[PDB]
Design a protein around this ligand. Structure first.
Ligand code: 1LR
Ligand code: 1LR
Ligand code: K
Ligand code: K
Ligand code: MG
Ligand code: MG
Lengths: 411, 411
């Protein structure tokens, strides 16, 4: 098993059109949530969310290449191209077989699907776009990235709702550790803010309806939370074998030392109150990393601002970490970004690596009145400079699908 | 790295509602393709496909449980429950943490998506079903299976178009080899025969339009092929660590010895004419298995009945296998079943294991006039009893995403 490091990163989020802009918002405690302007939601129960603002796909692709592609693919490609540029890696005939891709999505091309269904119902099947299928199916992020950059290694795509970006990064790391690849571009992307998306989640009563104050909507572990905030964007990491990164003089942000999974096997959307599945997942990830719970300094929580979800994670952290639960810092950056679904674990793995780089825990904004038992250091309200040698990122997603990543300062 | 064996299998296909019925059709050279009766396609350019005929979800779930679920989830669960029953494994508090799930889908709940879009456009967002999202998103096969059986191990879902079932099985095997699990239920499911699906693929000109003779439509490597046939169904395998299977006295069908991946990085739907990516994938899988190409007896091809696709695989087999390309037998069971997309690699991994069990290569039906260079033993027309110690199953899917599995008689 070879060591795996992070050498490039890329992002579109509700806080910015790249990583440094996003992270500057994060550390300032800025909200990226606002009334949605890209469509008319006056008929809907939730009318706000986390949108990517001012994205120009022409920075990344020709007009010819871009018109075929759903926004979730456009966003995954943007993050991907940023991460490859940031890495400095040169792709050649000598290494292309050894560079793969694993970009995922929770729901994929819902906008294109809705628009092609309109054509179908109103006009007939021959009005469907000839690019509908390739521009909309989930594995075409990985497909198009590999074609655009000539990447010939392992090529696949995860779809695990809120855990997508976490699993994608973890499994890509396993590719590298196993010797299937030397480099992987991994992460996720999502653009589910169409009528079907907001309508669908609203019908399931999953979303906050705090339409009067959108920036106060996402409030993880706060007694007045009322559901998650739907957000859009992408994240991508360049994962690299350690000897390969060193031989080319790559800048190394951090090491990816552990990856853990479990299933709650409990309920379609609420975890058990004791967070038993989440606990097993975190332990699995710590043990994969060869770390004791006392070695953990920062956790970037799943923390979506849901009743059952948020408290289960508090219970799970207490179970795993014992008295040390009170020494570590845990925060939910979803307090500012909302829930990017398939891209959540990607952008949050980035925020974890950057907490390492900058020695600072990002805040949980809006944490005005912590609920019963929510008495840990949840970094309420403002960023906390502190020693961080080891950072976790948790994703405890729809269906009870759990993943945890463990990153460490590189030495 | 621990050894991984196959101890149970399950399926819905166009040939049958379980594995033995399907396989009996396969060995008889029966076509499962017919005009579609479940919806009116008189407005469409392709009006036939491979449908699951006479499925009764009540054999598997209560009416309450089933009404929430898209057919692709119903089908994945059916195959899954069959495979667990076939395995004989008892799930307990002692082993549940060690049993996981990886069921995938290429497109997922397209029928539910279309129906909820109608409600949206005609009536408004509050008419969307409250079960739309959990009953339609791809990871809910794995989610619902884990909740129904209490499976607490690794829980995730692949989405890689035609390669989905292959990757799902391969990666699940890696879980077991790595020690993340002792048992995985793996495979895929698909029900893309709605208006959006047939319309979408027809707009992309991907489908045969041989409406006058549907059973003659799917004709891999035949000079008069004109596109793939869309088919529905599911497959699932119970994968198990070898010591665990032996300790309980499990019946072992075969061993899963290798798994390989690559990306063509060439084109959104056509592979390169020389099948260079497919060759690398097969070599990767053989090398993972510690096998020489001369040890291969049977290949269950990708062979979807497309111009570019089918010939690339012939070129790739010649490249990898040299003169031995003429000694092995290769067939495309899609000649009878059509292309089950995300379920293709699952049902075809099953057919590969059964070729091992029964010492017989299934036929490529309709192979009347083999195209230029298609001069291998493609098992044209009728089944061929022969020695088979090692069987490959290939999936060379949309975006250039390739996967190969290697199974061997167990000793
Ligand atoms: O498209 C970008 N970069 C890019 C695209 C394809 C390949 C590379 C590469 O370095 O190999 C790249 O940097 C890009 C555009 C805007 C901001 C950052 C990266
Ligand atoms: O539902 C089936 N079986 C089933 C469902 C849930 C658990 C088990 C089990 O053995 O643990 C099972 O066999 C079933 C139904 C028809 C045909 C084959 C299996
Ligand atoms: K997280
Ligand atoms: K196959
Ligand atoms: Mg560059
Ligand atoms: Mg049983």
């Amino acid at each position: 098993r070879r060591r795996v490091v992070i050498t490039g990163m890329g992002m579109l989020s509700p806080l910015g059109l790249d990583v440094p802009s996003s992270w500057e918002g994060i550390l300032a405690g800025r909200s990226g949530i606002a009334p949605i302007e890209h469509m008319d939601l006056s008929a809907y129960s939730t009318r706000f969310g986390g949108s990517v603002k001012g994205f120009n796909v022409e920075e990344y692709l020709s007009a010819k290449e871009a018109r075929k592609l759903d926004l979730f693919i456009q966003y995954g490609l943007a993050a991907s191209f940023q991460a490859v540029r940031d890495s400095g890696l040169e792709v050649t005939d000598a290494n292309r077989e050894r560079i793969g891709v694993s970009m995922g999505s929770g729901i994929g091309g819902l906008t294109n699907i809705e628009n092609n269904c309109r054509s179908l119902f109103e006009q007939g099947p021959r009005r469907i776009s000839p690019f509908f299928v390739p521009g909309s199916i989930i594995n075409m992020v990985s497909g198009f990235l590999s074609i655009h950059l000539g990447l010939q290694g392992p090529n696949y795509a995860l779809t695990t709702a809120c855990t997508t970006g976490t699993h994608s990064i973890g499994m890509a790391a396993r590719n590298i550790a196993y010797g299937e690849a030397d480099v992987m571009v991994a992460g996720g992307s999502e653009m589910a803010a169409c009528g079907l998306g907001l309508g669908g989640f609203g019908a399931a009563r999953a979303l906050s309806t705090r339409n009067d104050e959108p920036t106060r909507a996402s409030r993880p572990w706060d007694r007045d939370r009322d559901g998650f905030v739907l957000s859009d964007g992408s994240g991508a990491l360049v994962l690299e074998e350690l000897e390969h990164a060193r031989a080319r003089g790559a800048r190394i942000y951090a090491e990816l030392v552990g990856f853990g999974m479990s299933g709650d096997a409990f309920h379609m959307t609420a975890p058990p109150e004791d967070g038993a599945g989440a606990a097993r997942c975190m332990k699995n990830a710590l043990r994969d990393a060869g770390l004791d719970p006392r070695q953990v300094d920062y956790i970037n929580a799943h923390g979506t601002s849901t009743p059952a979800g948020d408290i289960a994670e508090i219970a799970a952290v207490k179970s795993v970490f014992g008295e040390h639960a009170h020494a570590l810092s845990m925060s939910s950056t979803k307090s500012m970004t909302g829930h990017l679904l398939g891209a959540a674990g990607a952008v949050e793995a980035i925020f974890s690596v950057l907490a390492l780089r900058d020695q600072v825990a990002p805040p949980t904004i809006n944490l005005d009145n912590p609920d019963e038992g929510c008495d840990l250091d949840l970094v309420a309200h403002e960023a906390k400079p502190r020693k961080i040698d080891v950072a976790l990122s948790n994703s405890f997603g729809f269906g009870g699908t759990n993943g945890t990543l463990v990153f460490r300062r590189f030495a």
